Subunit: 167 residues, 6 copies
């Protein structure tokens, strides 16, 4: 039913560093910030943990166990606090980090909104079975990205993946 | 202690095929609506999923796998987002769907408010052990229905089932 | 693939107040006993807890909180130790204890084998959505009871519920 | 990242026996009460009454009271988004430890707020508590950080500087 | 029912370093090794992880994050693999590590066997509510230590804590 | 610590598309088959048949087949005590990653067995995989360790030497 106050706590999962992926993330935030059902949105790449005991932090380099633990935990905490996950899923360059989080969230029985993106719309539509079945709601990033703004995150109505070939 | 904002998110479980069951649900919603500790209430039968590929869907009839998965997931999603469960539990015609849900919620360690209803208030009081022990708070539907309007859903104070024979 | 040793640990859930229910349980045990994939089977009604402080305990009567907690925990313990659930599910007199258990087990992501029994094989086939979608494998009790003797409990191959109307 | 509404739901776990512990809990509540990221705080000692219990604190309690009270706490843990533990380093509270392990098994964040009146002793911590806790806020030197900590996201802060037994 | 092969996988939780505590642990192993229902016993202090990148490992000293992570995980893994936990619980010098594991295991719905030990049998019998309620079976270390040898770990029958004052 | 009977129940997760992947899975099975600590190994590709599916691999599959097959895998994960993932570092398999995250959320141990045919590229790993996995066994240089690894206790071996993106 209608919520008395915003209840949606979003874990915004998404790959980063890549030009198009950052743009998607940025646009996702705007859209979500426009959603009245959202009480909070957590994006893993926003703020980060700084290990004072880490000389020259190499983004993409080895990285200390403390930073790794703290960063990984910040994400698990976001997943823990969240009521649902929204994943800007790159269908051209699959991100195992995001896939990991999708699996983790489904094991917690939390709803997962898949927002698939492809720069090759002409190519065959295929999806790993685990993603196609694990995801509870799909919102095409290429055609329905805007929906993230209207989607009722207080209840996260499901929408099973369909139309994708499965290997 | 006193909450700054309503935090109770209720998964209102209930059978919904008899007139009496739906009337209780209606009444439950009204009472819950008057509780200042509630941020949101989810009732499984309020919306529903529509499978476009499902021709002439009938209730009680063979449903498409897609509709089944979508609908079942909407309930698990409601359970996941909820902080507690409130079950309008029909003691005369046991509902296995509600029982399944109570079990699911308890496995998740979530408090479960049982609200038993019987059209035979004078008959023997017996309850299955799993329900009697599984529920954390009991509010008699026959004589205490109305406290749903005042119960503190921010903390869901416990009230063990007592006075029922166990078989 | 082929297991070096039986690994299937079955939580055999079942009502156990009618003669027909206990006869199915008896039969189920015998069949399960012949399955080489089974390492262990737990039946909730086999042993039992005795509360010394409980004077003249009667079945269906008011039981001590200690007995209730001990007995309920023995079942949750059985569910925890089990790799899968096998429910001799009475379709004529729905058992909420079994339903609660099926829900509990599924919340734990454990496979659940439903073995439906009805004294009216010719009547309508209807099942609650939560049970129909919650169970992972269905083995008709009326006509396929005996495959419990051969089912591979090391892997519990899935067999979705189909052919039942959903209400 | 900025919350539209406070979402932090705190389970304030803590021993409530010595006067010192009672004082810490009192302060914590006051401090948490000023944190704008908190929507609710649950303190287990703010109880259930067994109408059939003819009862002495520390005495034999009825199983009903025991069940109801234990559940009230698990319920608080279930509803909570994170745990804040006024952790007595001098008189170890196994109840609090239990709850910490419980919360972590649920993958929830745990903010450890240790207290020690014996600075003279080597700062040591059980491995399980050291690795289980996700954020540490020294109760003797950083107690006040509870009024500002962002419980909407519970930023991690691994335990360090503590010898592990 | 009777298991076809040993099914009990024990997570043997216990404090260490202390003279009496090591002795208890040593005796526990002997007793358990004599139990036909046990398939495996994991004791956290037996073998350990060696961090090649750890200069002079100080047992009780700071210790690297890698060692801490690996060691902590070895314990969580033992808890994960185990079907039940057996805790040699020191009532004189409370161990929060053990209490942590008890809470962790109960959250996973696994049975927990408490084996309390005290060197001051004359002192008041008291137990924290969380331990007294969380534990599913108590076997007095001081009087029934031997039972660990007969206890059926394939089913872990419960035995609620009683007789202990609760603060 | 010595098991009375093998208790290791392995969920052998892995892509099964390229011939190289098919070869690795084939070897892994053979290797695991010699490990005395293993009681059972589950390989998802060893399938369900939808009698109502009139079916092409890679094509649109019926929802029944999808559900049954996906569940067969979750069932394998549920029954498993640990996961062994023939992790293709060249062509990332999101299915395997999903399963790894799923298993860790269940607190189960995950043995990562990475494979790369491009040693020339900087050994890098997504943080989630690097921190999620509990034990790593290089598939290109330690593949054989699978026949000796003690799956009864799955000893930890944190991921190191991998740049984290
Ligand atoms: N370095 C990192 N800092 C924070 N979060 C990270 C990092 N690497 C992976 N993740 C998680 C969050 C994304 O949803 C997904 C990106 O692959 O997995
Ligand atoms: N057809 C259905 N649509 C939506 N929810 C349903 C359905 N059947 C069962 N349920 C769940 C929700 C109720 O709490 C309870 C009713 O038995 O179990
Ligand atoms: N009195 C009882 N003793 C032991 N187990 C019991 C009891 N009542 C319900 N159960 C559980 C086990 C069955 O699978 C199912 C029977 O309804 O729920
Ligand atoms: N008597 C009690 N009433 C309510 N909660 C209690 C009690 N004893 C222990 N606890 C729980 C809550 C604390 O966080 C911690 C205190 O040891 O464990
Ligand atoms: N240093 C350690 N190595 C291995 N396991 C450890 C360590 N410290 C605590 N534990 C866990 C296991 C015990 O059951 C309990 C002892 O407090 O908590
Ligand atoms: N078509 C399929 N049949 C069975 N299992 C499958 C399928 N696709 C993905 N999986 C799961 C199992 C693998 O570990 C991993 C392969 O990507 O994810």
């Amino acid at each position: 039913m209608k919520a008395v106050v915003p209840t949606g706590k979003i874990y915004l999962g998404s790959p980063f560093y890549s030009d198009a992926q950052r743009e998607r993330a940025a646009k996702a935030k705007e859209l979500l910030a426009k959603n009245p059902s959202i009480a909070h949105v957590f994006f893993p790449f926003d703020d980060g943990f700084t290990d004072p005991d880490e000389k020259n932090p190499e983004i993409g380099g080895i990285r200390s166990m403390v930073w790794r633990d703290a960063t990984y935990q910040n994400d698990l905490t976001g997943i823990s606090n969240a009521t649902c996950g929204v994943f800007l899923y790159d269908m051209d360059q699959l991100d195992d980090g995001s896939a990991f989080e999708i699996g983790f969230m489904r094991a917690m029985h939390k709803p997962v909104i898949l927002v698939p993106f492809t720069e090759h719309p002409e190519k065959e539509k295929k999806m790993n079975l685990m993603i196609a079945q694990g995801v509870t709601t799909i919102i095409d990033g290429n055609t329905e990205f805007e929906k993230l703004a209207d989607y009722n995150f207080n209840e996260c109505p499901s929408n099973p993946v369909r139309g994708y070939g499965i290997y």
